[PDB]
């Protein structure tokens, strides 16, 4: 027996059933370009997560209103959606979960947030800044654009303290140019 064998893993996306739907392709390209995604796999992963959440909500809504399982899991799901900013306090019913779109999840990406608060001139600039270790959520440097920012952590986004845009120690290019200009 190899103990590593007991670790489990799972897939995070599925390929489209019909590869060459023109309307689907146009919509997907529009979303990818708007949010600066690297490929269709990221969009399909977000769609997979949204489908899972919507299926859970739909399953719960089938149960009786007084069912303890429905109460427990619905509260858990609503709290989860509220923590990540998907739903507003007024949106306090499982029904509003079914009205969630891929755009709602995409708007919670660290890349989209970094672009929106004004730390980047463009969504692609936000991507390159994040992957280059210039952004931190709290006191932790984050380099994953897919990072889903919670409501509480949204206001803590700032430049990394060890980066040129957040502290001192300019980049290697600037240091090299300064050294060259010293002569």
């Amino acid at each position: 027996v190899h103990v590593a064998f007991y670790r489990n893993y799972g897939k995070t996306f599925k390929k489209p059933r019909r590869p060459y739907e023109k309307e689907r392709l146009d919509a997907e390209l529009k979303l990818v370009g708007e949010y600066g995604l690297r490929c269709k796999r990221e969009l399909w992963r977000v769609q997979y997560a949204l489908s899972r959440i919507r299926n859970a909500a739909r399953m719960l809504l089938t149960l009786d209103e007084k069912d303890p399982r429905r109460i427990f899991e619905g509260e858990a799901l609503l709290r989860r959606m509220n923590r990540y900013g998907l739903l507003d306090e007024s949106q306090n019913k499982l029904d509003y979960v079914l009205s969630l779109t891929v755009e709602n999840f995409l708007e919670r990406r660290l890349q989209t947030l970094v672009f929106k608060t004004g730390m980047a001139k463009s969504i692609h600039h936000a991507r390159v800044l994040i992957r280059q270790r210039h952004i931190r959520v709290g006191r932790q440097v984050v380099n994953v654009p897919s990072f889903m920012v919670r409501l509480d952590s949204q206001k803590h986004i700032d430049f990394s303290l060890i980066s040129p845009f957040g502290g001192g120690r300019p980049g290697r290019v600037k240091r090299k140019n300064q050294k060259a200009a010293a002569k």
Binding site: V1, Y6, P68, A76
Partner: protein
């Protein structure tokens, strides 16, 4: 197999031990002793996993070989010694006395007890019969044998045993109206009072127990341990007093505590 198995795979360890899936390929196999393998808590788990005195298997062995841990007032140096329900675990160096009791979720909990409360334990009688020379005796479910027992004591009763003298100082007859704790099944760790007993010839007997909050549950006779006469247990119960809380109320309490 051609004989006794000496190993226990970690996935095959009882779930109430709460062993990590990726901690290793093996779990401590309980040794022979007063308690069954599936219904025990080896000293290695208590000292390492629970009390965290030892960070490793070797540290557990080192601690135990100093003769620092006592079970039922007797020093035990066996790491896989099966310590089970109602047993007393004492560490004189740290002035710690523990009693092994089931929590509402059915897992062994090291319940800290006072010095006076650490001098006795409860036992459940299996049967009473005549030994050699006609000497009557009874045996408990923790492997103990006592000669010349009180004639009133009978099977399924609870006896208060003084560890210092190894003598029965009191006993409780199994009857309706007694507070009991369930020691097996899905209701293990719950505490309530017996309401009625159903007896079926050539079959297990069913016991109906009512929780302090009015909740009702039933279990087999072999899963019921009497804790006192009437409604007052003879020993201090762990936190929760054997009251099983639904997941909804548990979540409500957790959310209230968060704020």
């Amino acid at each position: 197999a051609r004989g006794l198995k000496k190993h226990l795979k970690r996935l095959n360890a009882p779930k109430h031990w709460m062993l990590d899936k990726l901690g290793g390929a093996f779990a401590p196999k309980p040794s022979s002793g007063p308690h069954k393998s599936r219904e025990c808590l080896p000293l290695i788990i208590i000292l390492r996993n629970r009390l965290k005195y030892a960070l490793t298997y070797r540290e557990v062995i080192s601690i135990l070989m100093q003769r620092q841990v006592m079970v039922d007032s007797k020093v035990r140096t066996d790491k896989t010694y099966p310590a089970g329900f109602m047993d007393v675990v004492s560490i004189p160096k740290t002035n710690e006395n523990f009693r092994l009791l089931y929590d509402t979720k059915g897992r062994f909990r090291l319940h800290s007890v006072r010095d006076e409360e650490a001098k006795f334990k409860l036992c459940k009688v299996r049967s009473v019969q005549f030994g050699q020379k006609g000497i009557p005796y009874l045996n408990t479910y923790d492997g103990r044998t006592i000669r010349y027992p009180d004639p009133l004591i009978k099977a399924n009763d609870t006896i208060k045993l003084d560890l210092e003298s190894n003598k029965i100082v009191d006993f409780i007859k199994f009857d309706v109206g007694n507070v009991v704790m369930v020691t097996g099944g899905r209701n293990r760790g719950r505490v309530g009072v017996i309401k009625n007993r159903e007896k079926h010839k050539g079959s297990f007997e069913t016991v109906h127990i009512q929780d302090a909050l009015g909740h009702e549950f039933a279990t087999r006779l072999g899963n019921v341990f009497t804790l006192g006469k009437g409604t007052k247990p003879w020993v201090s119960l762990p936190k929760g007093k054997g009251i099983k809380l639904s997941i909804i109320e548990e979540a409500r309490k957790r959310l209230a505590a968060q704020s």
